[PDB]
Design a protein around this ligand. Structure first.
Ligand code: NA
Ligand code: NA
Ligand code: NA
Ligand code: NA
Lengths: 408, 204
């Protein structure tokens, strides 16, 4: 169905068609350069200007203005319909999940005398995410991901999310010492990223690609006839969500094997957005399409030698010959019912080993639905209770909280 | 094959091996070992000595051996077992699962040690499972880890034979003596007897 919002947008004829923000730092994060790249569409005029202003609450921190016309990039010239503005920020307040310091960037398209055509705005967090020496660093410090997987689920409305349930989830996550959320396994509603900017949660943004049911699992993702369909799902996610400071890691999807389409889309993201690592689990969690070893349900001390995709123990996995990447479990500690036995063994290992940087618990909320029996009394239904066949019964309910957000 | 260099008693342990006035004396002990023993097929690893800290003389003698004999790896434990003077991480008595965070020379657990950032070398314990008397408890934990991890390639038990000496009491009956029994002072008593076999080569 139509499960998210429908809206109408009226734009002027000459308009801002796209804008990118990127933050670049010195060695001790005392000087930042906000590089803003604004694109227009419509008819170019020489009186058109772009002002990018940066605001910390009510005070204005930086500002720049420029006419259109980019730098020369090749033999044919540059982009006549693009600008790049570089704003110097001295001692910026850095964004993290601990302290979610945000700035407000306002992009004004206006004429040279000064009448405004259109303004756009986004929240800006100064943060750098990079992998050096095998460690995922945020602002020069190694992260420990206290993460949880979260589906968009409401027991009455299905997959329709409103703001009040999102705020209820984020408060319960931070009150239970979570600092990260994995968007499993699709891009969320756009308000979710804004709220994770505001309250402070790291977000793994994940493309809407899963072909778990295929035999073999990479039957579509190793086929170049499906590369246009897969690329749209990746490129339009990155184009929608690249300005959010809470998004720190891109994910190529879930459980799609490992085909050549993943390697191509991995390298596409590293080209357009070098500021975020890319992870991908399929094909054994340590393929060339991932910056981070991200196994699903690998154990702490026990190996699981499956043919061609073994799940090593996470302590062994780090020490395999030639292996240098950090390890962050994209799913671990499957919370199905009365579960999370041995959860302390993961967190003993996370604190002991530097390259084990945590993981994402599967998962946040039970996907149970509400039915009514005969007296109008509601009851929680799982797979099979709607006549669906075949179904997977109670494997839909893996949450740390019930569907009405009361805790397990 | 191990060079005859140990300056365990120095404070700090690299007082002589970081001094270039001792580099001629240290080099003779390394270069004449390699010149004597380089043709033996059983010698597979050169060792720069034992327990001498980590000085610049070790780095120079490491690179000397790699120049004259590229066919054998060079290992050296001193200075925290993972210095630039060793091809192999070779800790002494590092445990399987427990870290020992000593200042400036920590003994990590051997599973953790392999996975430290930027670390790629194999790990072979140059001394482990100290067999002093009634000992080798937890020896199976090492061999579970050796078989599970590829870059843990085993180790050398300390040690083979007790260093006990024979004295005679009053009837000519021999008895096994350890440190202190000859009037030597100060001495380290029974730490000389760490063997898997007795001094007459009967097994523990
Ligand atoms: Na860690
Ligand atoms: Na499930
Ligand atoms: Na091994
Ligand atoms: Na001894």
């Amino acid at each position: 169905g139509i499960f998210r919002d429908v809206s109408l947008l009226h734009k002027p004829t000459t308009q801002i068609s796209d804008f990118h923000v990127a933050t670049r730092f010195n060695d001790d994060f005392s000087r930042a350069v906000l590089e803003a790249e604004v694109q227009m569409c419509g008819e170019l005029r020489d009186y058109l200007r772009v002002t990018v202003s940066l605001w910390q609450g009510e005070t204005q921190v930086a500002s720049g203005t420029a006419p259109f016309g980019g730098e020369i990039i090749d033999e044919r010239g540059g982009y006549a319909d693009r600008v790049t503005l570089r704003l110097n920020v001295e001692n910026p307040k850095l964004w993290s999940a601990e302290i979610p310091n945000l700035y407000r960037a306002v992009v004004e398209l206006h004429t040279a005398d000064g009448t405004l055509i259109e303004a756009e705005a986004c929240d800006v967090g100064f943060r750098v995410v990079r992998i050096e020496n095998g460690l995922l660093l945020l602002n020069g410090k190694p992260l420990l991901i206290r993460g949880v997987n979260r589906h968009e689920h409401h027991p009455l409305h299905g997959q329709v999310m409103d703001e009040q349930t999102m705020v209820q989830d984020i408060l319960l996550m931070k009150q239970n010492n979570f600092n990260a959320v994995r968007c499993s396994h699709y891009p969320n509603h756009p308000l979710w990223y804004t709220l994770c900017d505001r309250y402070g949660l790291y977000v793994v943004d994940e493309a809407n690609i899963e072909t778990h049911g295929m035999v073999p699992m990479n039957r579509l993702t190793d086929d170049p006839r499906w590369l246009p369909a897969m690329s749209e799902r990746v490129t339009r996610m990155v184009q929608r969500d690249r300005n959010h400071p809470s998004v720190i890691i891109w994910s190529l999807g879930n459980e799609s094997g490992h085909g050549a389409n993943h390697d191509a889309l991995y390298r596409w993201i590293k080209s357009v957005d070098p500021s975020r690592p890319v992870q991908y689990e399929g094909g054994g969690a340590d393929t060339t399409a991932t910056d981070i070893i991200c196994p699903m349900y690998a154990r702490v001390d026990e190996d699981q030698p499956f043919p061609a995709v073994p799940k090593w123990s996470i302590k062994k996995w780090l020490s395999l010959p030639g292996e240098t990447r950090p390890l962050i479990l994209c799913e671990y500690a499957h919370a199905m019912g009365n579960s999370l036995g041995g959860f302390a063994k993961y967190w003993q290992a996370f604190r002991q080993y530097p390259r084990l940087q945590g993981g994402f618990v599967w998962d946040w909320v039970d996907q149970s639905l509400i039915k009514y029996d005969e007296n109008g009394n509601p009851w929680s239904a799982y797979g099979g209770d709607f006549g669906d066949t075949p179904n997977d019964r109670q494997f839909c309910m893996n949450g740390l909280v019930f569907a009405d957000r009361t805790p397990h």
